[PDB]
Design an enzyme around this catalytic site. Structure first.
Site, PDB file in Angstrom:
ATOM      1  N   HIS A  61       0.856  -1.204   0.000  1.00 19.41           N
ATOM      2  CA  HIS A  61       0.000   0.000   0.000  1.00 19.41           C
ATOM      3  C   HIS A  61       0.885   1.245   0.000  1.00 19.41           C
ATOM      4  CE1 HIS A  61       0.481   0.382   4.436  1.00 19.41           C
ATOM      5  NE2 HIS A  61       0.319  -0.929   4.426  1.00 19.41           N
ATOM      6  N   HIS A  91       7.503   6.503   5.463  1.00 20.10           N
ATOM      7  CA  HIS A  91       6.772   6.142   4.245  1.00 20.10           C
ATOM      8  C   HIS A  91       6.093   7.408   3.719  1.00 20.10           C
ATOM      9  CE1 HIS A  91       3.789   5.673   7.472  1.00 20.10           C
ATOM     10  NE2 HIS A  91       2.999   6.226   6.545  1.00 20.10           N
ATOM     11  N   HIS A  93       2.490   9.020   1.512  1.00 18.30           N
ATOM     12  CA  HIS A  93       1.192   8.947   0.856  1.00 18.30           C
ATOM     13  C   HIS A  93       1.201   9.956  -0.301  1.00 18.30           C
ATOM     14  CE1 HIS A  93      -0.542   6.735   4.411  1.00 18.30           C
ATOM     15  NE2 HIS A  93       0.364   7.447   5.033  1.00 18.30           N
ATOM     16  N   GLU A 103      -2.562  13.565   3.449  1.00 21.04           N
ATOM     17  CA  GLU A 103      -3.629  13.046   4.302  1.00 21.04           C
ATOM     18  C   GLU A 103      -4.164  14.191   5.153  1.00 21.04           C
ATOM     19  OE1 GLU A 103      -2.120   9.250   6.162  1.00 21.04           O
ATOM     20  OE2 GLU A 103      -3.568   8.524   4.652  1.00 21.04           O
ATOM     21  N   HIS A 116       5.633  10.549   6.368  1.00 24.56           N
ATOM     22  CA  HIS A 116       5.380  10.169   7.766  1.00 24.56           C
ATOM     23  C   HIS A 116       6.628   9.494   8.333  1.00 24.56           C
ATOM     24  CE1 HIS A 116       0.740  10.190   7.132  1.00 24.56           C
ATOM     25  NE2 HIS A 116       1.241  11.390   7.401  1.00 24.56           N
ATOM     26  N   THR A 195      -3.241   6.056  10.346  1.00 23.53           N
ATOM     27  CA  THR A 195      -4.195   6.386   9.274  1.00 23.53           C
ATOM     28  C   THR A 195      -4.448   5.189   8.372  1.00 23.53           C
ATOM     29  OG1 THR A 195      -2.564   7.172   7.693  1.00 23.53           O
ATOM     30  CG2 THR A 195      -3.409   8.773   9.271  1.00 23.53           C
TER      31      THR A 195
HETATM   32  N1  D9Z Z   1       0.075   6.434   8.170  1.00 25.22           N
HETATM   33  S1  D9Z Z   1       0.685   6.305   9.636  1.00 25.22           S
HETATM   34  O1  D9Z Z   1       1.990   6.786   9.784  1.00 25.22           O
HETATM   35  O2  D9Z Z   1      -0.274   6.840  10.564  1.00 25.22           O
HETATM   36  C1  D9Z Z   1       0.723   4.694  10.010  1.00 25.22           C
HETATM   37  N2  D9Z Z   1      -0.425   4.014   9.951  1.00 25.22           N
HETATM   38  N3  D9Z Z   1      -0.197   2.668  10.224  1.00 25.22           N
HETATM   39  C2  D9Z Z   1       1.078   2.347  10.513  1.00 25.22           C
HETATM   40  C3  D9Z Z   1       1.432   1.027  10.832  1.00 25.22           C
HETATM   41  C4  D9Z Z   1       0.481   0.022  10.837  1.00 25.22           C
HETATM   42  C5  D9Z Z   1       0.885  -1.295  11.158  1.00 25.22           C
HETATM   43  C6  D9Z Z   1       2.209  -1.569  11.435  1.00 25.22           C
HETATM   44  C7  D9Z Z   1       3.177  -0.546  11.431  1.00 25.22           C
HETATM   45  C8  D9Z Z   1       2.729   0.724  11.142  1.00 25.22           C
HETATM   46 CL1  D9Z Z   1       4.110   1.714  11.237  1.00 25.22          CL
HETATM   47  S2  D9Z Z   1       2.096   3.756  10.434  1.00 25.22           S
HETATM   48 ZN    ZN Z   2       1.359   7.322   6.861  1.00 27.47          ZN
END
Ligand code: D9Z
Ligand code: ZN
Length: 257
Positions: A61, A91, A93, A103, A116, A195
């Protein structure tokens, strides 16, 4: 399985992850006139001189750059944080067009992409424990606008061809994430969530006011990645962003006036 498409996108997530309709979800729109200046807030302390990057991965993703977080190498402290948070990955978006992709939004303006930098609170010992806590994570959010090239980003851009499809990874050592920061570290902060699923409400968001600029050619190369695995029907990795969620009972605070 969740994703960003028409049949499995953000509007569907709540069916497998009911916290999607929770009280501190992310991202949100930052209304600059409603944000509260808080002179109790300290400057950010970013200490990335000893960061050790390891690997870059297409996880289906987004693409992640991963760091060694077995010790206090790369840490974030200060700002609204209490304690030490270790960098574990970053990473992006991004959008299919330059007018969308971020976002968070600022007075309903969307940027081309959003960076992020994910960090976890060392007091909980490991990342899996930290996501279980209301103060477990701190994510540094940086806006990308299209303009002049960001030289510090080109090493990332050049390796994307080797991790085009889901599940592909490549050695990625000696990358210095200092090259991705804006000049000023002024910020907004609010309590929020991951997110993507599982959408846990464990994040203290720190969103930088000053965007960084990247070329059009640089973000073009982002848009050449694939959500699919090798050998599968090609689906370009674009618009992997979640739209703004209601602020609810939250205050966004500003470190500047
Ligand atoms: N887009 S974000 O940075 O809020 C983010 N959302 N999910 C994340 C995540 C989910 C599962 C495992 C590790 C991570 Cl780092 S990191
Ligand atoms: Zn993110």
């Amino acid at each position: 399985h969740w994703g960003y498409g028409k049949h499995n996108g953000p509007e569907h997530w709540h069916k497998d992850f009911p916290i999607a309709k929770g009280e501190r979800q992310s991202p949100v729109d930052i209304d600059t006139h409603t944000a509260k200046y808080d002179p109790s807030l300290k400057p950010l302390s970013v200490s990335y001189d000893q960061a050790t990057s390891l690997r870059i991965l297409n996880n289906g993703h987004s693409f992640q750059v991963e760091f060694d977080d077995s010790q206090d190498k790369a840490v974030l402290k200060g700002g609204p944080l209490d304690g030490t948070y270790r960098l574990i990955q970053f990473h992006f978006h991004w959008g299919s067009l330059d007018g969308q992709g971020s976002e968070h939004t600022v007075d309903k303006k969307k940027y081309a992409a959003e960076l992020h930098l994910v960090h976890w609170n060392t007091k909980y010992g490991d990342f899996g424990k930290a996501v279980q806590q209301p103060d477990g994570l701190a994510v540094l959010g940086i806006f990308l606008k299209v303009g002049s090239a960001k030289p510090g980003l080109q090493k990332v851009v050049d390796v994307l061809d080797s991790i085009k499809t889901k599940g592909k990874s490549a050695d990625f050592t000696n990358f210095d994430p200092r090259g991705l920061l804006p000049e000023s570290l002024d910020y907004w902060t609010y309590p929020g969530s991951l997110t993507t699923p599982p959408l846990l409400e464990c994040v203290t968001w720190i969103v930088l006011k000053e965007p960084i600029s990247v070329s059009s050619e640089q973000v073009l190369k982002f848009r050449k990645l694939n959500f699919n695995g090798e050998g599968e029907p090609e689906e370009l990795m674009v618009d992997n962003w979640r739209p703004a969620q209601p602020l609810k009972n939250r205050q966004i605070k500003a470190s500047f006036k």
